[PDB]
Design a protein around this ligand. Structure first.
Ligand SMILES: [Ca+2]
Ligand SMILES: [Ca+2]
Ligand SMILES: [Cl-]
Ligand SMILES: [Cl-]
Ligand SMILES: [Mn+2]
Ligand SMILES: [Mn+2]
Lengths: 130, 130
């Protein structure tokens, strides 16, 4: 099983975090983890929000961003060129953002599934989500 | 002059659109245009919004996304790996999003300037923006 992990899924893995048994089994059993270039910015941005809200010290958030960087080396990172056209058509059809549609496009492309903690996304693509 | 164009700047160029004399002179005089992988998703997402709001027919929005794709071949497209660490530190320091900070990080990296139609962004980096 090829497994796409979006930004919410990476956030739960790259540092110690609580995860459903379901999430863990998917990651555990995957042949390989895949994501998009996009996820790097999305995870980093969520880290920025946490810092500015006073939940992380600035040096602590900077250290975590190093860890994210190191985590990304264990991922197969795909580019926008591979999915952009499919992502847009999926966004138009299903009424989800191109950002979200992109991960679904990628799961389809690699013949795999998507792990997302986004329940709303997960409901729109039952055949593609774990 | 190396010129970074963000998503708002690409939107004004990849199809016939009104532009300030200032924007035109910057693009005209640039040695080369540069952007991020990120901009592809951001422009496509803005196109999706326009379609869903009833401003573009679905086939018309799909044709424009083809044009965007063809436009991107004239751009030097840089990846998240080149800017992510700088983008985060700039986001923390200046109180802007990692998404925005990324283009500024890229202008700095290539020794060039940034063309953005985002006045708020443009005010935070006067030395880096056209
Ligand atoms: Ca396709
Ligand atoms: Ca640097
Ligand atoms: Cl916030
Ligand atoms: Cl909208
Ligand atoms: Mn979401
Ligand atoms: Mn903006």
């Amino acid at each position: 099983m090829e497994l796409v992990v979006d930004a919410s899924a990476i956030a739960a893995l790259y540092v110690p975090e609580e995860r459903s048994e379901q999430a863990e089994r998917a990651v555990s059993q995957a042949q390989e983890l895949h994501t998009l270039d996009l996820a790097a910015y999305e995870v980093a941005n969520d880290l920025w929000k946490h810092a500015r809200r006073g939940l992380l010290r600035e040096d602590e958030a900077s250290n975590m961003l190093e860890e994210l960087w190191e985590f990304f080396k264990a991922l197969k990172v795909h580019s926008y060129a591979e999915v952009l056209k499919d992502a847009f058509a999926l966004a138009l059809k299903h009424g989800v953002t191109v950002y979200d549609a992109a991960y679904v496009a990628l799961a389809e492309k690699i013949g795999g599934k998507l792990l997302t903690l986004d329940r709303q996304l997960a409901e729109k693509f039952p055949a593609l989500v774990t």
